[PDB]
């Protein structure tokens, strides 16, 4: 299996946690030069030509972090708990992970994306939109050890991978008292978290 | 089951046909007076907390209308096309559902919603990601029937109740000429597609 991606990238670090999770190896590429200058034609096909990350598993590409998270853990998971079959607890994996991307994710590359890339001046209005989604996910957490049902699954190295990120930009997670509480408890749970989340950090703690 | 809705909604309109596909009964509550003043605390309690559409089967609550119909496709579907069991064919039609709701059902929402409900300005930059959002479907129909695989799948649920929602307000789909042949050869296919999704949409048509 071939992984596109970026250390950086909330999203590549979800999958890469999943796939740790999941004791899955990958073949890592590194998508950096991937729109530089004179890369060849040959060099250019082989490039995922929608968003990163991307897998390549024998053959049949996939884009779209939270599709790839819950194709690994069907097609490679040994037991149930990651997402689990059954159906009432799998539809709350896939509430959590569709919250996940259109406000925790949103709201996160709302606000850090101009920022960090353009260097453009802060929106208050985009950082408060943090605030707002981190008090959904603070109330998903009220009596509950992880984000989605009563074990680790998905939607918790999926929201791990942004919430880890905030922290990292020294977003300030105390008034969050559920996620502050989820978020000392999970890392140590999380397989490989050090090697496939904390360690590509680095860029935002700089 | 309830069901938990209003009539234009396209996220109601996806999950009532959904169920319609699925020859499956709900309950339908409509939720329009459920922010009225004085509605009893007693009334309040049953209200959906989150989001509509909420459905209520036999005691589990679910709300985000793509967790909604991935759940009815396996909890109630007789076959596997709407929602294939094959783990590649799933994960596509997964891919499919976030970038509707990332992309198609946002560009929608983002254009139309200021000026339906708030009568505001038309904001021309958000128009154009109508038709960037177009585009990205446009492509992924290129020499196919279908916009998640080889035949009728939730994906192509969703993405009419936002695509006929287009249609409705006058939005030419002509040059998207894969969304048009798609959306023709749909419809007919489609059960029950003019009580539970066109009916609705003579609000907009209006």
């Known amino acids: 299996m071939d992984f596109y991606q970026l250390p950086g990238s909330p999203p590549c670090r979800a999958v890469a946690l999943t796939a740790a999770a999941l ?8 998508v950096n030069l991937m729109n530089g200058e004179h890369l060849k034609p040959e060099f250019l096909k082989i490039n995922p030509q929608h968003t990163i990350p991307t897998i390549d598993d024998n053959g049949f590409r996939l884009w779209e972090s939270r599709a790839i998270m819950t194709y690994l853990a069907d097609q490679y998971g040994k037991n149930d708990t990651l997402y689990p079959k059954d159906l ?12 996940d991307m259109s406000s925790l994710y949103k709201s996160f590359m709302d606000y850090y994306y101009p ?3 353009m ?31 009563k074990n680790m699954t998905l939607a918790d190295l999926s929201i791990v991978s942004t919430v ?13 008292k559920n996620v502050t509480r989820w978020f000392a408890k999970i890392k140590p749970e999380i397989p490989k978290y050090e090697e496939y989340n904390n ?8």
């Open 199 to 206: 360690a590509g950090l680095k860029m935002f703690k700089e």
């Open 23 to 30: 004791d899955i190896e990958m073949n890592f590429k590194q």
């Open 115 to 117: 920022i960090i890339f």
């Open 88 to 99: 009432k607890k799998r539809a709350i994996v896939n509430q959590r992970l569709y919250f």
């Open 119 to 149: 260097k453009a001046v802060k929106d208050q209005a985009k950082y408060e939109n943090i605030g707002t989604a981190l008090s959904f996910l603070d109330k998903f957490l009220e009596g509950e050890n992880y984000v989605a049902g």
């Open 164 to 176: 880890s990120t905030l922290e990292a930009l020294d977003y300030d997670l105390s008034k969050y």
